Subunit: 310 residues, 5 copies
Amino acid sequence: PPPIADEPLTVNTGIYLIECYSLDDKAETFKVNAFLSLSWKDRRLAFDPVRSGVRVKTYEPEAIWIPEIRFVNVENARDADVVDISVSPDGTVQYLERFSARVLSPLDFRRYPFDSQTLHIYLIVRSVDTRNIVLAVDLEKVGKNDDVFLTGWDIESFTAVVKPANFALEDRLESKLDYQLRISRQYFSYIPNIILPMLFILFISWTAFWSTSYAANVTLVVSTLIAHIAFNILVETNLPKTPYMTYTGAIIFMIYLFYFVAVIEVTVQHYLKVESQPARAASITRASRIAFPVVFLLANIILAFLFFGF
Amino acid sequence: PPPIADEPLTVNTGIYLIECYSLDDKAETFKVNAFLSLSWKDRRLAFDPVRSGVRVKTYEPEAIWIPEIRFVNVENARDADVVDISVSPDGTVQYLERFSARVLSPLDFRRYPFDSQTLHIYLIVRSVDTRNIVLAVDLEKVGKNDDVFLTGWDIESFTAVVKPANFALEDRLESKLDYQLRISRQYFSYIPNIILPMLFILFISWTAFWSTSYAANVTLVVSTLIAHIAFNILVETNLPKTPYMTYTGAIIFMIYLFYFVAVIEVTVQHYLKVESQPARAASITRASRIAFPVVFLLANIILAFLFFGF
Amino acid sequence: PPPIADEPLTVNTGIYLIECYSLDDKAETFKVNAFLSLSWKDRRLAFDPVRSGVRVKTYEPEAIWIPEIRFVNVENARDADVVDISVSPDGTVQYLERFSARVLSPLDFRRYPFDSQTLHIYLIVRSVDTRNIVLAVDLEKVGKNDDVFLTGWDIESFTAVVKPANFALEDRLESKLDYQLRISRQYFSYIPNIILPMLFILFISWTAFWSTSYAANVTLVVSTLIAHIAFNILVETNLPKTPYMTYTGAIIFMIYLFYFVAVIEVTVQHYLKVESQPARAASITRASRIAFPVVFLLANIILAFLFFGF
Amino acid sequence: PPPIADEPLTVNTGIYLIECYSLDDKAETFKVNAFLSLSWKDRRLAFDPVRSGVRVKTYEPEAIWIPEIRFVNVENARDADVVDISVSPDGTVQYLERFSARVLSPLDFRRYPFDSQTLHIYLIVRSVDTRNIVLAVDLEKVGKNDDVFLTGWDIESFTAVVKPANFALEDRLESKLDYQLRISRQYFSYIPNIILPMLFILFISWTAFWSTSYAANVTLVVSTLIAHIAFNILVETNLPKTPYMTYTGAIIFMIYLFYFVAVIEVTVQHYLKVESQPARAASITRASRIAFPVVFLLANIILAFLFFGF
Amino acid sequence: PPPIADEPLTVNTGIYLIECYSLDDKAETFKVNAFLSLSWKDRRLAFDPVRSGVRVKTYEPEAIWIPEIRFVNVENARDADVVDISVSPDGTVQYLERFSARVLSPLDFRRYPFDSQTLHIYLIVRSVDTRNIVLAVDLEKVGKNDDVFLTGWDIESFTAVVKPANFALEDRLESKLDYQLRISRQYFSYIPNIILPMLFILFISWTAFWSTSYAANVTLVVSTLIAHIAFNILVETNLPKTPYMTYTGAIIFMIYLFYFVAVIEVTVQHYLKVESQPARAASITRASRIAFPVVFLLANIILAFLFFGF
């Protein structure tokens, strides 16, 4: 029994983030728990101030006509409890619920180890014999407690796109609302656990440029190659199959190469030493101890610029 | 209280995909969230335009008789909320729900690393004292937002098989409807994380064809053998027990062989060098450094053709 | 309000398997989704054909008295939706539901890698002021679509034990019904991923019978010992703590021995070579290169027979 | 509307275990599925045998006053379905439900690999304007099918503590009932997969007492040290953070020491051999090959006695 | 239909912890199961002692007006069952429920291996046409059975902040109540499984200061480096991405350095021995065997103080 209008009914929205958590980098989701603020003028609900009780009159969701406001990008339907309906005298209704859903918005792991993300929540509304348009009421969009957690990420800013996008689906237009949560991953921890450890094994590998023994050199360069796989796999895990290349997956793959030519070298600095040509052999090894480190640091300036610098 | 017909009642179907996700290669499933469009002529519901209110009259699911449309290949029953019922004057009903289920359709990992899949959804309907036939109304089968995600896969095309298959179960025929989702796995990421890394260790292994030391050679060929197991196991995991052979599991198994004959060789290039016959020994090793690489690349053209080329 | 009989009321059962999946070898369970067919004569429900409407009269589960048919070996209560109740004129009721539960039946990993299993579903019924006996109606026990999946297993045959077992519990007898699903694990994949890889490392280990160097021999025999642990652990995982010995766990444990005596030997073929007694030393090593391989293949014929052959 | 007594109302309890499973050593829980038998005399429910229908009169849980019997040590509320209420003529009520909950009782991993445990279920009841006391009726406490599974454990005996413990909580006493399930872990499988494999690597380590080469000795003693970590970690996992020391965690830690002094030795049997003092060096190594094995077996008799023997 | 006051209505709270468990260090949560004690004077509920039945009159939650007391920091809504409502004659209501939720409170892994935590539960209440203030009634806040488990932690003290914080949200103030659970992690188990094992490999690494062989030294220092990664990764896991540095992650990272300079040394103690300068070479190695151990123990006193001592 919708409210009989003369034109499009405006439903006024606002989400107050109470809780954030379980951002799943693997599954591209995240859990949230907030308020849902809704307000619309239903004239049938007007009620003569002085003639009746107080300022406002509260109802049970049953009696009043209430808009169906579905969330778009949610795995399931949001488990919500109704906090309060307060019908103004003029007919203005003040609906308020506290929902709890897991939303589904994509993530760009382009600069993975260090990256900012922007999460979305959508809110559509299907129209019937009348049209509905949703729209934000910033005084409730302020959605953010000063205790919003979401570990591993720095929460930048929760806001909403004031202009709804009014689609037109299966005959009957709908009104969508974009709510936005910006976040910057807290890297750091990635250094002492991935970056640094992963580099040290790379360096230790090429102390085989100051060694003349093939045995201790295969042991040296190969043992570390393994550890880099241990790291490659470790990272490879908490991270989805992007169709594109990831910054840290680039450097981590480039590192595979330095282990190969490293071997190529030691394997060659051998076919020369035993080829009674140690004149040339220890010339190559002499070069390596400068080439490798330079071309690496060099290549990272190139690579890092390639990603962030562009 | 079914609508009294004169023949088979046609229920008109249509699924509008709103959300896709959680394709579980392991468990052969996937999660979806869409619209369910249903339409049927119930003559008892006809209602004299001018004599009553407006064009259409909305009901609560309770009052009207509504067909039971079960999904066939679903783990459980689909959690659905009813968006709208709109009874036309002639009696045409316009049912619409937004469901959310995990479907269960098989996958062919025949060309695993690079493979296309076709997902299914079924929709049956059991008949009573009357017969029901389902059938598509393409204007609602268009089921696909321009935001359909499903990570790691490229979504080809959502469509439906217009002709239902009318079984006959436990006395009382049913009408099934095949809805189809085609997808092509986004490989790529498999190269810098599996393919390439896995090859490099294979090459490094057989730099032992340019080495004359049994120690650094066992170290060489064996250490890498291990890493290939590390890779074999890693892949082996996110992948079910197919009764058939998988493309990447073929090459990954074929690789086990090159590590064996590699050892065979170095183990033999030793029983000869110490058998004061280094004439023959370094003849074998000289061969290996060409045989191995050729017969490999060679065998892949064979194998790859065997899979995709046929 | 049970139907007043003159003797034991027969409830007629039948399960039509629609979906199978999630056989958890670890947890000894498995998920199923089927029809539940129930039929019983309630004479109070008889209804004069010509005097009233049609052949049969459908009810809502509420009105009619309906038997409580609990599943015995289920983790929880089965999530079921009622498809149809159709009361015959004589009083014969035709109940039909589509349930979805995870059943709990044991598994014998005696011949693990290659083994057949028989799954169970139970269906009891508690009696009140009257006795109930359940019993199969094969025309609904046919429970099996030609699309029954259950990956990794070959589904042999779904059937039911026609004779119920009528216990007697807490005063008030019950009627249990054994439904049976036979399955044969699809091994195969176990070869190129466990069996073969696991053997190759065993062979490579004992190329140390054609080597005279203690260093490359410890490297050889030990490195592979490790990989066999990597395999031992890998298998050890997707497999519960049986109180008995498993076929593949037997060979995989027996393999541990060949790595020990292998070491014993190389460790001994050393205390002799350095004991200026290389006459004896290379006599032992000469033996090993025949003993080991024979006694192994030999022991497997013994072991394999021990399991399957008996 | 409680039954008006003259003193404390006795509610008669009894749990018939139908299903056991999912004992989580990690989380100290376990899942069960049983009957709940309750019986109490409500005199208002008396009903003149001959004047009315039959022996007993069945009700829907709604009508009758029924005691709230909460389980104490349960994660959540137990999902129960009501099987039957049968009011005797005198007023004796016969309540019966089939519940399904996960209980939470502690475990003592003191003798971990081989240990017996005793599981608990509690059943309290809060009193109102009258007092309630619970108490067992052994004829229903017999709770145990001859098919009670619970894999990996041998089920000893299900019984109940007949005397309730009547606390006094937030003003209003309660009656608690201790039900007990004794179980003995099926070890065995721990031998061929942990114990034995873990020992073999320990032995192989100290074949370095019959070797004079520092290289093959570091390779020997170190490689195995690693595998023992592989085992240490493997075990360390399916096992909670006890504040006390676990039997197998003791021996597994003690093993770490034999790998250290082993290294100490080989590292010392080197600083002597190169110190032109091989007289002393191969005296130490000669000792080790007897000391180590003895002091180990010796220390286990000590340790094992320390745990089980005391 | 709220109770008509003359000022702010005081609702009296109290949580009696019955069960604790599933503290997820990863997800910063934990599960609890307790009583919820609520009491408020609703004068409309007053009921003339002698004129009617007994002391108190019990209701079903339906009839009475009852405050909505939401938990703040909970993933979802708390699954609660209502134990008893007991309306006093004056109008004092005695509400009591037994809820079961997972709460979400942060954790400081600053001194991780050894650390105390303080868990929170919040309880807000939204006001309508009247104001509500919550407040503790210590006689029910005593929330703690003498069987409160929560494995791996020592439970210090459950208490509540008597003064509520009265916010002001979306127009309509609310009353929040801070309940506090203090806990001290049971470390210990971290020694024989992480600390000690992790140290032993560090020591064994630098027995390469008493060795003159580059091969057995790379083998020595590198093999252990790996194991420390095995440990680094193992710990790295059951532990979230803190933006700060963790005590055990500090020492575990500092350990990476001692493995690098260790290599630096052995790699240098080689470029000197082969540079016909063994005078200097074995001077460096002589230093190391004292420098390393000192500077380590030294650095830990520094580091440990840095964390706990400050």
